[PDB]
Amino acid sequence: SRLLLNNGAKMPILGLGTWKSPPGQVTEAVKVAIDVGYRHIDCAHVYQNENEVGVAIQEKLREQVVKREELFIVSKLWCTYHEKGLVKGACQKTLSDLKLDYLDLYLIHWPTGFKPGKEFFPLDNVVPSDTNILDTWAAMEELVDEGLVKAIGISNFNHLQVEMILNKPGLKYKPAVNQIECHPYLTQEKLIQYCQSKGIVVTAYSPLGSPDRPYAEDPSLLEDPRIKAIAAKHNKTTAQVLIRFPMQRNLVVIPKSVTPERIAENFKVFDFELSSQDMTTLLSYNRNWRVAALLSCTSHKDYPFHEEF
Template sequence: MAMLRAQLRTGGSMPLLGLGTWAALEGECCKAVKTALDLGYRHIDTAEIYLNEREIGQALTEKMGEGVKREDLFIVTKLFETRHHPDDVLPACQNSLQKLGLDYLDLYLMHWPYASKRGDNLHPVDENGQRAYGDTHYLDTWKAMEKLVDAGLVKAIGLSNFNISQMEEILTNGRIKPAVNQVESHPYLTCNRLLKYCTEKGIVMTAYCPLGAPGVHGSDYTSALNDPIIKTIGDKYGKSAAQVCLRWQVQRGVVVIPKSSNPSRLKENSQIFDFELSEEDMAAVNDLNRDARILKKEEYQRHPHWPFGEPF
């Protein structure tokens, strides 16, 4: 498939469509990655906390053995919040590389602006059973990540779940400017303010949960896939609601990483480059915004670096 790309400030580029692997079931992830690569996907997104880097590495090794070129792949993983101390950044990156079976990463993201207690326990708690916070400032973490670029271990570094004020601090004080900020974004959480800022600063925005979160219960959120306006727009173009949601993002210049292990959905999600939404339809999707955030991370609300205290 013809895969359009977003230009990065590094001079490189990344495919506008990637495969998200958060919450991919054990055993399914390897198969999903191989299916995606067979369909033409070249951008795979993971993280240490997803606990699937080794499985993804197995899929990559197998497909590269069948002729997929490493230089055509765009592999993203993330530094977890328990690894924010500057001394932990290099070992964490090396550990991810080893699991993925790679010599370098195309993009390494700081997963969250806040730090948790250092150590190998990815879910540390304090004596009260509450999340155990760390006190490392994300700027110190960023400066350690810059050294990964110097060492050739990563091609680009970026952020995830950072608000505008936090991004501004990195841009002002960092030596290397972030290439990407990956955030939750879908028709009910358009992040127009953040996208405008990123565009002005030469940062690519990546949207996770770009379809909302079908199947998430117990929240005030309804899946965008069931929205009558999106369905009507889809009917107009002979496309599904999912394809409309994804097309709307890439047409805004936003990279999307929908997650699926279903081969037919993987194929459907990739078929978004053969149509274009009209200005009127783009505006109609934009107007659906209700600032409905799925991933609120309220257990970190007391942390000084919790990002959701200001609008996105």
């Protein structure tokens, strides 16, 4: 139920996402998640709720429901902190809000660096930084040497950007994970095949198609009749099928939910198996549709989505 990372740690295949989870609902959501059995929580500074996520974690550690070593906490470095001197500072802010002394995994959220400041998305659309991916990676590597994070990774990096880090002169720490958008409408067969051949674990975000995305005629995965049929045959819900889908592709999945019953439902995905036919069918539903396309950074020198994969 856990995947081995290149650093020797074991990462729980199922995690709870926290993007869009209200500050007044995520503490209770994480508390319930931990009781239900979740041991992996996906976080990020830009989500503006790590302090509240941290409240839930501390309560459970205090209750002794779990030990710190049983939990796998993940967070990400936002685009406005790509400078060499701003990385440790961003990581420490997150550690304070979460009320932890170390993170299990720290990811470079997006390959695009923005102008450092108060705005998460600085504008003039989007002011870039002259920093590059290799300089930021070297700063991430220092976080490991100082003991702030157990492992470092990337997110939304295309194969060429992943290659750039892998061929870095004096590369000390290899990216442990590449978190990307993945579901039946954006299968990512090529990037997943690429990352998995390099010992990099793939985490699939927006597994249900992110039905509550801020940007709202759009296609719905949870409402797809073809996927509802597969779910009925296994007597499961379409969400459990959509969550079981990446698991059988050897991917870590992090569905988001602030609803106790759905959080519990999303956990009941270990007692069934999708046939090889069900899998091939789900893969054929690919349309190359993205929920997160970073539209504002279309002309950024490091925009990841111009290459095929």
